[model samples]
Target: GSEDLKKLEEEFDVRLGVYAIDTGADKEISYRENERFAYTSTFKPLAVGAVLQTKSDEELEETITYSEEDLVTYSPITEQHVDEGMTLVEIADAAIRYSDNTAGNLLLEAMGGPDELETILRDIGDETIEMDRYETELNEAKPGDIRDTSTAKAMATTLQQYVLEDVLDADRREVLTNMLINNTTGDALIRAGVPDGWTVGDKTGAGGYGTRNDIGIIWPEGDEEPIVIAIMSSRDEEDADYDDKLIEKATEIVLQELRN
Candidate 1:
């Protein structure tokens, strides 16, 4: 991984933080654990978890009706007419698997606000995390906006609770994980590094500026123990493709390390 970091630095200049935890062995291996990175839609999973924890199964199946103002840019959920709008759980799937801004906002509002997520992170002992607002309100960012920030450790801790610990009821957690496995973003990151038939379920974020992030579980082979990983990057917005490659490289380093 050290070599991988060096290789990544050789290719580009990007701030990165990564966390890899072995759930079966109960071990923690971290890189840049305290460095903060923009946490765009990467926050979706935790928001989905909070939404699930608060909403009943019956409530989850209800349909949604969104005003035009509630519709957000950068996600397909907004494109779909609200009249044919997805269910609450389906909305959660959009937020998680599709990284839909409108869906995420819907769930976040239902849970209250950034305060609810903040409280959840705080309860997990991640006091330094900065989850101030949603992308729907902020909409855009420049370098160093500091609007939403998190460390690898904080994110890994959050995912560890979901993938490794008994934080939610079985069905609820299952749906959450299934949503991640169905994720459609982050091709140049963790998804690229996985070998055939190995399991990698991740949520990704593209800030459309200087952020790219991926976090979730990697279960090698069938029924084997899983490893939780959080990989995040921030760099020049103009070099978005290069930034994606860097994330790919960093995640490749992590996967290679774990695969050994």
Candidate 2:
């Protein structure tokens, strides 16, 4: 398994990063875990979690409006509701579930921009995530660029804290996890790697340089604690499209090791 993991990058002709931990046993499987990778939409779940931590239910329910000028490409959810307006929570949901670019920018603005989001990560004990741009721009994912990036281990750790630990109150935690579980963008990626009976709550990211990432929690039916995993991959070509099957194969490697 270790040898296969070592060869994964060459095997698929992509840069590969993976981090997986069995929380109950404190066991880990890692490869290029500390290397930086553009987060893309993988940050949506935590961005929503940050809002949940800072805002009240009533505060989040207040409606807000935006114009055509505020819209960005790939905003499937928010583009339809531009005139009708959306609540804070609704925007958060769209960002997480659909990776809506407009909704993500709105959420970042509502929270005082990407710097404030970085502060929230620091407050939650993650020092490796750096959010320096908004949706479409952040997804540019220039090779060797450190902006808008996070390490696989850092992201997996923070995910465990947000979803598995008691960082947010019970109700808010449930809301966040449900949004993640309902995510529509990850079906052919990490979701395809798990067994039929196991459950997954995940967020995926796609960007330039063929960057594709998935970070989330998985439960093996009756287990009391879940396994937290992050897989970040990118091709060398500037115009390469994302490969969902690559992520699925990387996840299969992690699961094989951890399940042993």
Candidate 3:
């Protein structure tokens, strides 16, 4: 187990940060000197949970229309249908499953914009996380600008609430978890190391100029407790695919350590 962590650090070229916690035991083991790092799309599942907590099934079913300007991005959903209305559930689904920026912005608008989401984040005990809109001024701006930022610990904490059954009600939590389970695209680090029949709920994040991250909860088969892992890396030496492979190697090391 001790060698496992060492091997991960050496094999992955993980220079900055990595954190993993067994929620059931409330134990944390990490190597990074600092616990904070730039938050990426890992924030999606939490954002989805926060908004869904406030809406009912009927409200989620109501479709909302988006202007051409709103759908201007490299999202799977928006690229497919140029101009059309989509339901709240549809937007949330796309945001969570596909990490669609357009859907995220749309859902951000429906949830009373960034200010409201920030308030909800604080209410849910994410005091250190900052969601600033001005950070994205380099790109186009809108009602729900995507300049949101969060630390690795903050993201893990947010997801932990859901795992602990503190954030969402029973039905809503199930929906959020399902969205994570269906997240097929993006890095396969956590999924690759996990065993069959085991469930993992995760969201991947990547941006221009070498930003890649993955954070999720791993529920091992026949295990009573879940592990919360967050891997945040920036400025990769290789391409995205290489970065993903490194992540997978790191994940295997961490899981092996835990098992031992």
Candidate 4:
């Protein structure tokens, strides 16, 4: 209902970009899908896909050493309290599945730098996306401070291309998609909103501030095509847990509309 949609919008005000595209048809839904958002860890898959696009499966096996320089808080890789070296594939895995900040930096650096990520965003026609600061710099950023950002439509579009276009070679696409499917962050977002028997491959990002975002493709069992959804929001005051359920309410409303 427009009533419900507007309610969700007013409660969680920010960019609040959302899109639900029915891959099998021309139907598309949105709530400011083009707006820019502070997309926390949700941007990791772009780096994963960027590396996968140019590197061979064998290249991914190459290892990079990890030490104190790579260590950061809010990292599953570092939360273990062990900063051991790992392969590119492993680092990418950590970046997506666990939203590991150190792993994200290592992968971005390996691909050249944050500039390379900007290239990837442009190559994919994501004009509203940017990966400027490394995770460390991102940690220290203040309000209105410039850093990595994306639009909901651009991010959802990236996932759509990965599934339907040859954005990456078939093998690499599988590797990245599987990692998205296994992601453990943003449980209260889209990943938690879908019903049982439905399969969703997603990546979640929550900024150190009050941003909670998730983007992914959801395959309702037995459907001809999946539903691509991207929901994102940032708050005035930093609250990691804020709007976790609000976004899901938006998801439920979108899905309920599509299911009809």
Candidate 5:
């Protein structure tokens, strides 16, 4: 289990995007840096960062009410009450932790609408990633034309910024990290091989039938620098399970390289 590098290469077809530093040594592995993928829910983490960076505690504390019109139609969180008033922080927590659609839209509203969210994203070094939809039809945006998108590299870069504590104020960064830690999704990927006591802060996105992705930071014990990783995949028509297996293999390889 310790030095099983070949198993990863053989188990799944993995295309890696990784930046790791160990004991003063650094390495970067990439397959396609410019290839784009639908961001899915992974975009929430960056949205969280942008909101925290631009808004104050009082501003973030502002409440946004989700009416019957805001119910996330396609998402799983829509079965509940159609109306409620939630704080920006609560909305963000639901957005990141449970991938709740209504929460995302509320946070989107707090970020000064989609246009301002894009502006804040640019302020934080995200230029190429764009929000494709202006509003969600059923609480959550539609997939065909209303979906949001971003690249693996951009997501990974944002995570690195958070880990380095260079994006927002220290307090804001801490809050953002806690939000990430609270994310209950994406456990099968980057967090798959990390130690029990280790901390992994990540976000996952899934859409378009079988598009799966995760990007985040892994901090092992006594390690001064954290490992930044991003895994993205869109399965072919014939290979339905390709994305899932790809993530498993990629995580395994990254763990192998890091553990070595």
Candidate 6:
């Protein structure tokens, strides 16, 4: 099932990692699924899920404000709402939907730090995922650097458990799912690859060393459950620009086989 993915890696000059599962059908496709790749913004949905698990509705609704110094690069949404002060849930929403750097950091701080995020993953039975730094810094994605990275299999399973399993209650579950579904940042990646009748809820990631990734839950038109997939790719060069098509094309390949 993954021969095409091997060729894809060669074609794009990337080390590609893929893991996809059709939950209701008990089928899967994998290629280098256990290899580590930078987490990048792909961690936001799980980070937000961890936050939701710990905070109360009132706590999540409490408005939080940040100063200019608190803002970081690529904080498109949070930077604009800096003065206005957004609720904790709103901040998490921005982090997931826009990949807002400041919002991610703020959510991390509120949850007591990156350690807490790791603890949540550990408690939830994921052994291959890690969170070691904040945004911009974590996105370094240097060659051979393993910090803030997860195997594609681990990421896909973690996402499946968090959003599809019983780990989160219905309300928070719905919030997380909707945030990914409405995400405004990843149209050209996984969202572009799935067929029209399907619905996608996804998070995208990009970083140094040519890293580009997309992880998501996809539902067929009339299906009750969903398929979970994570595609992570990175080239060897330090300054290589992203080939968005690496993930987009990979998505196409995976879904085509999975459609069987």
Q: Which residue ranges in model 6 land beyond 4 Å of their true spot?
A: none
Clash pairs, model 2 backbone: none
Model 2 misplaced stretches (Cα beyond 4 Å): none
Which scores better on TM-score, 1 or 5? 1
Cα lDDT listed for each candidate: 0.75, 0.88, 0.67, 0.76, 0.64, 0.89
Write the residue-wise lDDT of candidate 1 on 1-260 in tens digits: 35567657657777677888776666666677787777778888988877766688778888777877667777686567666766778888888888889888887777777877778767756676677787654424356666677778788778768655777788888899888888888666787877778788899876745667889888878788988888877666644643667666776777666556
Tens digits of lDDT, candidate 3, 1-260? 23555565556555435677876666665655144444556666766887777877788888788777666455778556556688887777888898887777777677787678778889878885666542132122121233555556677777878755666788778878888878977446778777787788888876533556788888888865888887766543433332677567667766766665
TM-score of each: 0.89, 0.96, 0.83, 0.90, 0.80, 0.97
Q: Which prediction has more favorable TM-score, 1 or 2? A: 2
How much lDDT does candidate 2 score? 0.88
Candidate 3 residues lying further than 4 Å off, grouped into runs, are 1-14, 134-147, 236-242
What does candidate 2's lDDT look like per residue over 1-260, in tens digits? 25677787777788888999988767899999998989998988888888888888887998979998889999998999878999989998999998999999988887789998899889889999999899799998888899999989999998888887888899989989999889888998888989988889999998989999999998887865789999998888888977788888888888888888
- For candidate 4, what is the lDDT? 0.76
**Candidate with more favorable, higher lDDT: 3 or 5:** 3
> After superposition on all CA atoms, what RMSD does each candidate show versus the true structure?
2.3, 1.3, 4.5, 2.5, 4.6, 1.2
Model 2 lowest lDDT segment of ten = 1-10
1 against 2, candidate with superior lDDT: 2
Query: For this target, which candidate reaches the highest lDDT against the unseen true structure?
Result: 6
CA lDDT, candidate 1, residue 216 = 84
